[PDB]
């Protein structure tokens, strides 16, 4: 179905949007710019990994919450 492919536009739409919220969200949670130096330090680096992980865990969590009600 031609319109069915609309799913790619719809899905890649949510995939891009989510990735952008992820980027902005995790920046606020993990990045401190005060007197910082262009390099992404170790602590900021791991915070990001864990941040990205909890964000997906949050997706599913919120997904199961909508499924309940």
């Amino acid at each position: 179905s031609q319109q069915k492919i609309q799913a790619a536009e719809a899905e890649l739409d949510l995939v891009t949007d989510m990735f952008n919220k992820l980027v902005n969200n995790c920046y606020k949670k993990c990045i401190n710019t005060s007197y910082s130096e262009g390099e992404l330090n170790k602590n900021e680096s791991s915070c990001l990994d864990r941040c990205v992980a909890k964000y997906f865990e949050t997706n599913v969590q919120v997904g199961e919450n909508m499924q309940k009600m």
């Binding site: 864990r50 909890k54 964000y55 865990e57």
Partner: protein
């Protein structure tokens, strides 16, 4: 169109979900010493989910009333 509505409706749903995820991740997930949601973060996400969906429901109801006028 009407096909646009069905698509727009799909995009709309992908909207809430996304905004909800972002809303609750921002208010609940503040610890990144680990990669998994604690017990407290899931509960918080549970309440946030509920509160937001409810809020979102109420506003939708008012939005329809005042929209007909």
């Amino acid at each position: 169109f009407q096909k646009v509505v069905e698509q727009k409706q799909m995009k709309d749903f992908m909207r809430l979900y996304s905004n909800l995820v972002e809303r609750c991740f921002t208010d609940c997930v503040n610890d990144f010493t680990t990669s998994k949601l604690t017990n407290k973060e899931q509960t918080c996400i549970m309440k946030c989910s509920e509160k937001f969906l409810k809020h979102s429901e109420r506003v939708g109801q008012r939005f329809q009333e005042q929209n007909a006028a």
